[PDB]
Amino acid sequence: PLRKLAFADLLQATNGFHNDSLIGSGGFGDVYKAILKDGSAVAIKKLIHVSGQGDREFMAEMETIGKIKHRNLVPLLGYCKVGDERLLVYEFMKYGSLEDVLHDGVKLNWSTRRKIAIGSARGLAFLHHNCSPHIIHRDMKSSNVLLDENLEARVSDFGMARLMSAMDTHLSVSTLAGTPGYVPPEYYQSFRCSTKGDVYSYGVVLLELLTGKRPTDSPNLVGWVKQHAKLRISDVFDPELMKEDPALEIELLQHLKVAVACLDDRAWRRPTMVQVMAMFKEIQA
């Protein structure tokens, strides 16, 4: 069950929110590495700009990830709401964000990379299909995919998530949300979001697992791949991934076709995360 944590507990667990506990800041809020008085290894997110862009992000997580539990979603263990202070407590993911592992670190062979791809996809599919009302993440990133002790992918950061009824195809919102390099093209043309939007953002992450490069490189990534898709597809994959096995590229290309389908400019043409799961299943069979 979720747990209402005293503000004092979080205060002393992080040594007065000391800099030594700080493992991430900027944007939404600070993230601290901490150990609760019961011995739980946790991460604590201190939200800034409360009663506005901070209280909305707070509620968004409480109303979505705070109410559900899944093997491939970051667990929200607890929360704290006092005055204008808003904090969130998650279980600590040992290897941090996928972005941190992908750049700067440990080694990720393809067998574990595809398990990261399957898991994160399974997490999203759960949000889109097994949850009523449906949950739209709206900020799927490599930095918002955490890796636990087993290098299993766990989708994180529901600060900008929204609830959509199962009888609808899209949700009209107040603001444009997302991260540059991950934003679906149609999110620019309208104030409407959808699960298909999340699929696109997932595609970019799958590309990061395949190429190894940031989405921003290099003139962007999605565009450059689409162009080289008509050229030599062999000169696009991750160098360190080909050293493992050259006869595995047939599986890599099939995974790439999954990534490309997700990245279609047309939302209606994109596969659902259930289809993405089903494609992964038919690839290794």
Ligand X SMILES: Nc1ncnc2c1ncn2[C@@H]1O[C@H](COP(=O)(O)OP(=O)(O)NP(=O)(O)O)[C@@H](O)[C@H]1O
**Which residues is 153 bridged to in the sheet?**
147
**CA 41 remoteness from chain centre:** 21
Active site residue 139: yes
35 annotated ligand binder? no
Smaller CB distance to Mn ion: residue 140 or 225? 140
Q: Which does 90 bind (CB under 5 to 8 A by kind): ligand X, Mn ion, none?
A: ligand X
Does the protein bind ligand X through residue 23 (CB under 6 A)? yes
Greatest alpha-carbon pair distance for the chain in Å reads 59
Q: Is the dihedral of CA 154, 160, 164, 169 positive or negative?
A: negative
Smaller CB distance to ligand X: residue 98 or 164? 98
Minimum CB separation from ligand X for residue 272, in Å?
A: 24
119 annotated ligand binder? no
Q: Which of 9, 38, 104, 139 is catalytic?
A: 139
76-82/3-4 β-pairing: parallel
Does the protein bind ligand X through residue 31 (CB under 6 A)? yes
Picking from 4, 27, 31, the residue whose alpha carbon sits closest to that of residue 160 is: 27
Q: Which of 144, 179, 201, 211 binds Mn ion (CB under 5 A)?
A: 144
Tell me the Ramachandran region of residue 197: left when phi exceeds 0, alpha when psi lies from -120 to 50, beta otherwise: alpha
249 annotated ligand binder? no
Q: Which of 144, 195, 201, 211 binds ligand X (CB under 6 A)?
A: 144
Of the candidate spans 10-18, 92-100, 104-112, 162-170, the one that interacts with ligand X by CB under 6 A turns out to be 92-100
Let me know: does 195 contact 208? Beta carbons within 8 Å.
no
Minimum CB separation from ligand X for residue 183, in Å?
A: 12
Alpha-carbon dihedral angle through residues 128, 131, 136, 139, given to the nearest 10 degrees: -90
Minimum CB separation from ligand X for residue 124, in Å?
A: 16
What are 163's two structure tokens?
């609830």
Minimum CB separation from Mn ion for residue 28, in Å?
A: 4
What are 97's two structure tokens?
């964000």
Smaller CB distance to Mn ion: residue 64 or 225? 64
The three-state secondary structure class of 172 is strand
Q: Which of 5, 34, 74, 225 binds ligand X (CB under 6 A)?
A: 74
Does the protein bind Mn ion through residue 159 (CB under 5 A)? yes
The three-state secondary structure class of 91 is strand
Q: For residue 20, what is the DSSP state?
A: G
Binding mask 154-173 for ligand X (x = CB under 6 A): --xx-x--------------
Q: Which of residues 243-272 bind ligand X (CB under 6 A)?
A: none
Picking from 69, 56, 254, 234, the residue whose alpha carbon sits closest to that of residue 138 is: 56
User: What span, in angstroms and rounded, lies between the C-alpha atoms of 191 and 194?
Assistant: 10
Does the protein bind ligand X through residue 139 (CB under 6 A)? yes
**Residues at the interface with ligand X (CB under 6 A):** 23-24, 27-29, 31, 43, 45, 74, 90, 92-93, 96-97, 100, 139, 143-144, 146, 156-157, 159, 179
Could you give the residue numbers annotated as active site? 139
| Binding residue positions | 23-31, 45, 91-93, 97-100, 139-144, 157
